[PDB]
Structure formats: C-alpha cells, structure tokens
C-alpha cells in the first residue's frame, strides 16, 4: 500500500510555514498521509513509491525554499 518515510529539514521550523508542507506533499497523487513535525525539524510521509518518490516531494520542499532529504523511515527505532 504505502510506505512510512522520514526526511530531515534544513531551513524553517514554524507551524504555519510547515503547514504548507502538508499541502505541498498532499499534491503527490500516490499519497496517504503526511503528518510532518513543526518543532522537531522532521517531515514524515506516508506515500507509495508507485506514483511519486522521495525526490519529487523533496523538490516540493526545495521549491518552498528550504531543503529536504530522507533520513530513513518512521521514528529512530520501532523495527516493525
């Protein structure tokens, strides 16, 4: 179905600005959820690697102005 990926944020960390992320990611067709964090400096995306990719959504964030890159997956631990 969908894969639960994490991305680490270099630029801004503020609720309303970050809120644009949600829409900028929800733009991806093959998306389910994108409950990004607006303090912890981490974006978290639930999307399928069929329709878009990390590179695409990364571009959406770069286009906002501030840089994005993958970290790994949901959380630092919880192997499941």
């Amino acid at each position: 179905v969908t894969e639960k990926a994490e991305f680490d944020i270099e630029g801004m960390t503020c609720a309303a600005c970050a809120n644009r992320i949600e829409k900028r990611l929800n733009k991806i067709e093959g998306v389910a959820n994108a409950p990004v964090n607006f303090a912890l400096e981490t974006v978290t995306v639930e999307y399928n690697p069929k329709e878009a990719s990390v590179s695409d959504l990364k571009e959406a964030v770069d286009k906002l102005g501030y840089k994005l890159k993958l970290k790994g997956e949901q959380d630092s631990i919880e192997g499941r």
Side-chain angles (χ1 to χ4, degrees), residues 4 6 8 42 44 71-80:
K4 310 221 272 274
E6 273 200 15
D8 270 27
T42 53
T44 304
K71 167 138 91 292
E73 57 189 321
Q74 67 180 355
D75 199 275
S76 303
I77 314 180
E78 199 168 290
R80 239 281 157 157

Side-chain angles (χ1 to χ4, degrees), residues 13-32:
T13 179
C14 173
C17 273
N19 212 143
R20 206 115 185 81
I21 304 288
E22 299 189 316
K23 260 62 86 81
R24 271 274 158 194
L25 271 135
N26 272 48
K27 273 298 106 207
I28 293 144
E29 292 75 9
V31 82

Side-chain angles (χ1 to χ4, degrees), residues 1 3 28-31 47-53:
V1 183
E3 258 157 81
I28 293 144
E29 292 75 9
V31 82
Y47 82 102
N48 74 65
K50 114 191 163 173
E51 233 133 35
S53 64

Side-chain angles (χ1 to χ4, degrees), residues 17-74:
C17 273
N19 212 143
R20 206 115 185 81
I21 304 288
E22 299 189 316
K23 260 62 86 81
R24 271 274 158 194
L25 271 135
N26 272 48
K27 273 298 106 207
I28 293 144
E29 292 75 9
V31 82
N33 306 291
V36 310
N37 297 318
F38 38 88
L40 319 186
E41 309 200 270
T42 53
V43 157
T44 304
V45 190
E46 262 172 48
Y47 82 102
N48 74 65
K50 114 191 163 173
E51 233 133 35
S53 64
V54 301
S55 293
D56 174 89
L57 68 85
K58 180 242 80 261
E59 213 256 45
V61 185
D62 211 317
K63 192 79 191 297
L64 285 159
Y66 43 104
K67 265 59 172 159
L68 188 69
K69 209 56 146 62
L70 209 71
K71 167 138 91 292
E73 57 189 321
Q74 67 180 355

